[PDB]
Amino acid sequence: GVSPGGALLRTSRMFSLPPVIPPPPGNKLQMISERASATEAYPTHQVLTTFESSRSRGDWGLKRPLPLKSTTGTTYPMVKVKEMDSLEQITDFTSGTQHGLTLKKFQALNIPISTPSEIRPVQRSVFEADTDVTAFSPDEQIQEAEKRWKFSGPWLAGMTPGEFKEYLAKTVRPKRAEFRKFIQKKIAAQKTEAANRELQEKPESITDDEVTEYLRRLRNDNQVLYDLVGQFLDLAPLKPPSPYGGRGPPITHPSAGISYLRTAAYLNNHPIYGPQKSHPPVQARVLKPRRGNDAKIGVAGFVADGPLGSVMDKFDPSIEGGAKLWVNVDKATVDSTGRVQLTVSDAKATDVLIAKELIGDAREPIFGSAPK
Amino acid sequence: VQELLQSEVTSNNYMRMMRRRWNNGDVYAPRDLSPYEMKGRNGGWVEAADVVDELGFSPLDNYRNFSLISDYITPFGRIRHSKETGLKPVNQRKIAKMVRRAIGLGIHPSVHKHPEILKNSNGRHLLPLVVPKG
Amino acid sequence: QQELNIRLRPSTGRTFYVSGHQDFAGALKLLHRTVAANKVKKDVRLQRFHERPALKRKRNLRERWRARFKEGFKAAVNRTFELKNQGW
């Protein structure tokens, strides 16, 4: 019954703009700044592009054409729109290269994302048919639920004392009746197990008496109870009797849609030298030197801890442009908060020399001149 | 030792101008290092959101906690404004009334923080003493 | 303390000690700032004479509007330079 004009808008490109997702979650009790805000952990608005011809006119498929002062001249045309029409009759926009190019930088490292491992390194891919699964069935047993990553219930350890009370009085309290039915289904199957077995050599599931007594038998073994309660509220397992239980489930996909590579078990064949041992190094910056009990380094837009090891010790104003060292990214993963934590590992000497050779800035060429 | 010491002072000087605490995963663009951004133009180190509602505690029922009453009064003994606390008008009125109850009951000073809290803070050995004079 | 009890008086709260990284000259700065954030000078001026409830209430309404207007004006002067930066 939709009108033809209303049927075109449903599939229009503008109507496809995703809603502004909540910002990257941070500690609920901090002193965040209000007037000034730095770049976020992950993007929140959709980045836009246009044709080189339509950009010279300021046409971005928006309400009105954007100004040419800050929208033309750059190589990569990227822009974010906070409001298509604000109270000032202007499209409140801003450059989107902060996050747009950071994705391109990270995708130039050629590194997959793997599930974190407690401290024999085992980098298991995130995109697998055994772990990456959201759909389920009620009949499924508790064990497979650990594999999942998208739980409907909240994380108890993460919730604040106020949020916890609200959850109890608005999600758990008005569920006793339904929970009683859930037990009946379990008790029903229990009666069928003995019958089926003896028959080799289900009931209507309506017994309000066994249920009450069934819960009094589990008061001495709280473990099996929580195991059952976690299935009715879809809570992330917390006790070892494990995966991502230290910081809780990932609010997003374990890869967070930043890289879709499954493994890095490849050897880039170099033209002259041949198949190299490790991956090409990457130059990074130095932020917050040791002399804060750790050093921060900027590896392709992201901030990660320095390798476990001058340069990191003290700051040096004389160095122009700042201290820049080469380094190899070993492992990358997404924490519960959504940040992209990189296991930056010190690079080798030959790798840097080989990689600089193509750039043409290598002081001494390994090819030919090198006698030994 | 003279050059090293001097260099350290100059190094720390710049470290004081980097008004930013880089964390793990925080994305930074070439603009985040500009002076306009490092200046920290924001003049407010304000609270995030209504600490009282998060901890879910009735202030009126915690009038005993002396450290809790000394946190919402200035060193002079004046209740802090909603700007500083960053609370809602209701939670502010509850904490404001919780500071007046304790001071009114006579179990907390009204012009400074509790004495037992002044002993654990800086200047413990310099606190103004009372000579017996007799 | 154990042998001498702390002198608990209004000046005890308005006290600032000298430390290695805070000399006498620096303590005065911290004092003047803390004495100005608590509006000690203003109170002395308002306590010199009596202001009946009506006048006090009406004086607050005038002062409170000039603060909201000023705060609402500073936000407009910075919203202008925000839109100007975008090129509008």
Binding site: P317 | P30, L33 | -
Partner: peptide
């Protein structure tokens, strides 16, 4: 490369303001 150009600009500003405070500290005494 772009970070270098931006970082160097920050060094200049830092050096100036640092010297400013030093000169501003001579007046306290």
């Amino acid at each position: 490369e772009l970070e270098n150009k931006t970082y160097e600009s920050w060094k200049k500003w830092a050096t100036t303001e640092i010297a400013r405070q030093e000169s501003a500290r001579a007046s306290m005494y």
